[PDB]
């Protein structure tokens, strides 16, 4: 994304969709790239603070994770994906998001559709699928508004 | 449609289903992989992951009036939609138990021309969720 503002995407946002290179990076409620995201805190310094979901050891696990700025715009490293990037493609900043990161990675993919607001946004997955086609995925979710009120979705 | 056209050997090389938890995982209810299709009526032979195995099934797809509508004889009756086949490359095919997908083809390879049918047939239903196999998936067992 040409010109990421990071001071723009402040607040608390919802997993819409996702999908994955590899099937077996979402297919399972524990699979390790199937993360809810809830809340992007951008700090001073222009890294980004993420809060967000997983579930783990039969929970629904609160994780924080701290993406750093790099070089590349719109790109941001990950001590917790063994410092594997995310990507974030494009964003209105008001309403949805765009993003891809690697598995813990140049060959594995996982991307989302974050929106603002808890319901189904076909505009913002109108995008997310255009964005996709250039992309190999295998598998695709779309989450409806009683799951993204849940928590981890369920 | 003429099921003696459908007779033979087939690969599932995408399935999409109205809820997540219909596909989502190796062992859910409707992750089946269609090895066969023999007319009598429409046997299918089938592989599903269940109880840790991949396990070889055959159910009995029952004609009706409709010439690409079968009933599955089960406790609960599941229709089957024959949405589109040319018979030699590819087939889809819609069960409503809820509604699962799946894009069918001859050899264990990516059609993508088939794809492209199959998304374009899937864009009023509601899908939740959506899996492409790979050819190394399709040549192996419960496409492990
Ligand atoms: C700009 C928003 C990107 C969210 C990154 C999510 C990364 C999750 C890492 C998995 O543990
Ligand atoms: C025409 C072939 C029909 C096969 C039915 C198998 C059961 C449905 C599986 C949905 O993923």
Request: aromatic fraction near 6%; proline fraction near 5%.
């Amino acid at each position: 994304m040409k010109g990421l503002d990071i001071q723009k995407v402040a607040g608390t946002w919802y997993s819409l969709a996702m999908a994955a290179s590899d099937i077996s990076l979402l297919d399972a409620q524990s699979a390790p790239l199937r993360v809810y995201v809830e809340e992007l805190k951008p700090t001073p310094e222009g890294n980004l603070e993420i809060l967000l979901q997983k579930w783990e050891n039969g929970e629904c696990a609160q994780k924080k994770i701290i993406a750093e700025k790099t070089k590349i715009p719109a790109v941001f490293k990950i001590d917790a994906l063994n410092e594997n990037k995310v990507l974030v493609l494009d964003t209105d900043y008001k309403k949805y998001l765009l993003f891809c990161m690697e598995n813990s990675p140049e060959q594995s993919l996982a991307c989302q559709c974050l929106v603002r607001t808890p319901e189904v946004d076909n505009e913002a997955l109108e995008k997310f699928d255009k964005a996709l086609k250039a992309l190999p995925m295998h598998i695709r979710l779309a989450f409806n508004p009683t799951q993204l009120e849940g928590q981890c979705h369920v």
